[PDB]
Amino acid sequence: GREFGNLTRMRHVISYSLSPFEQRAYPHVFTKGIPNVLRRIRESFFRVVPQFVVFYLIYTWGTEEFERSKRKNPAAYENDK
Amino acid sequence: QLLDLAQKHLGGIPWTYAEDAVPTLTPCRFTGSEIRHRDDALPFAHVAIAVEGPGWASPDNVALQVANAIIGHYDCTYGG
Question: What's a BP term from Gene Ontology annotated to this protein (chain A)?
Fold first, then answer.
């Protein structure tokens, strides 16, 4: 079960391969590669991105509220007189 | 006797070729690939490996024959 000699029992399968020296290292990396990457990105965009956008909104508001708190209070001095 | 006999029985075979368009043999390319048909129900594994070899009409083949004899064939029955 841990040696290539005996791992599983398969039947009726064929495989075809070519030598590394008989083929290009970057085949269709301009017409077929980029579109596949775009498919990958698009297929998982809405599953991740939006949550991290919420994080950014929480981060900005926080900082804004923190600084907003340190501003002096005109309502604590109107009557101080 | 053989030549005189062949004249009577093989002289009629056509010999003029259409437009002398003799089918010259085009060369053949060799590619390093692999095919693996896996069937685990068969008794023994059975592989064959090869490389490009000279044509039928090159001197080098003779030397290769010798090299082949050095490797030698084998079988389980051989009582060596």
Answer: pons development
